[PDB]
Write an enzyme that holds these catalytic residues in place. Structure first.
Site, PDB file in Angstrom:
ATOM      1  N   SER A 136       4.001  -1.840  -6.753  1.00 54.54           N
ATOM      2  CA  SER A 136       3.055  -2.516  -5.861  1.00 54.54           C
ATOM      3  C   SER A 136       1.621  -2.035  -6.043  1.00 54.54           C
ATOM      4  O   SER A 136       0.685  -2.788  -5.747  1.00 54.54           O
ATOM      5  CB  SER A 136       3.430  -2.331  -4.381  1.00 54.54           C
ATOM      6  N   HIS A 139      -0.257   4.515  -3.454  1.00 53.94           N
ATOM      7  CA  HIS A 139      -0.018   4.744  -2.026  1.00 53.94           C
ATOM      8  C   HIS A 139      -0.431   6.160  -1.596  1.00 53.94           C
ATOM      9  O   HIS A 139      -0.340   7.109  -2.378  1.00 53.94           O
ATOM     10  CB  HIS A 139       1.490   4.578  -1.662  1.00 53.94           C
TER      11      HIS A 139
END
Ligand SMILES: Cc1cc(C(=O)NN)no1
Ligand SMILES: [Cl-]
Length: 145
Positions: A136, A139
Site C-alpha cells: 500500500s 506506514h
C-alpha cells in the site's frame, strides 16, 4: 533483548544505541504473544502503491523516495513533541482511517499484510514503529492495546 532488537554504534557520536529490524524503530534507551492487538497508523502513498489514489488526492504522483522523506519528517515532529501522532494522522494519512485519528481496531494474525502484521505484533503497548513498507505504501504504526 526482546524479539527483533539489536545493538549498534552511532556514526556521529560514537555512543551505543538500539535498533529493531522488524519494526525499524531506533532509540538510545535499552528496550523493555497476544491473540490480538489494536493499532493506529499513518499511511503515505506513492506512485507504485497498489492503488495510487486517496481521499486527499485523486492521482498520487510522488516518488517512493519523496514519500519516505515525508514519513521521516512526521517521525521527527512526533518524537520532539511538536506534534501529536493523532493530529498528523487526521490531517495527512492517505488511508480512509484518517477519519478516526488513524485507528484500525483490533485484529489477529492472518488479516493484515504480512510486514504490517509482523511489526504490529513486535511492538509493545505504547510503542511506535519506524517506517514500515507494504504494497500500500509506507506506514508509521502505534500500538494502543
Ligand atoms: C524513547 C524511549 C524508549 C524507551 C524505552 O523503550 N524504555 N524502556 N524509553 O524512551
Ligand atoms: Cl505489552
Amino acid at each position: 533483548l526482546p524479539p527483533g532488537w539489536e545493538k549498534a554504534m552511532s556514526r556521529s557520536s560514537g555512543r551505543v544505541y538500539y535498533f529493531n529490524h522488524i519494526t525499524n524503530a531506533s532509540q538510545w534507551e535499552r528496550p523493555s504473544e497476544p491473540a490480538r492487538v489494536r493499532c493506529s497508523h499513518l499511511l503515505v502513498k506513492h506512485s507504485q502503491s497498489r492503488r495510487p489514489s486517496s481521499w486527499r488526492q485523486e492521482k498520487i504522483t510522488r516518488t517512493k523516495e519523496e514519500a519516505l522523506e515525508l514519513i521521516n519528517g512526521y517521525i521527527q515532529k512526533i518524537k520532539s513533541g511538536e506534534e501529536d501522532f493523532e493530529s498528523l494522522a487526521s490531517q495527512f494519512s492517505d488511508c480512509s482511517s484518517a477519519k478516526a485519528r488513524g485507528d484500525l481496531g483490533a485484529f489477529s494474525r492472518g488479516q493484515m499484510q504480512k510486514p504490517f502484521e509482523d511489526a504490529s505484533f513486535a511492538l509493545r503497548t505504547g510503542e511506535m514503529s519506524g517506517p514500515v513498507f507494504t504494497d500500500s505504501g509506507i506506514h508509521i504504526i502505534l500500538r494502543t492495546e
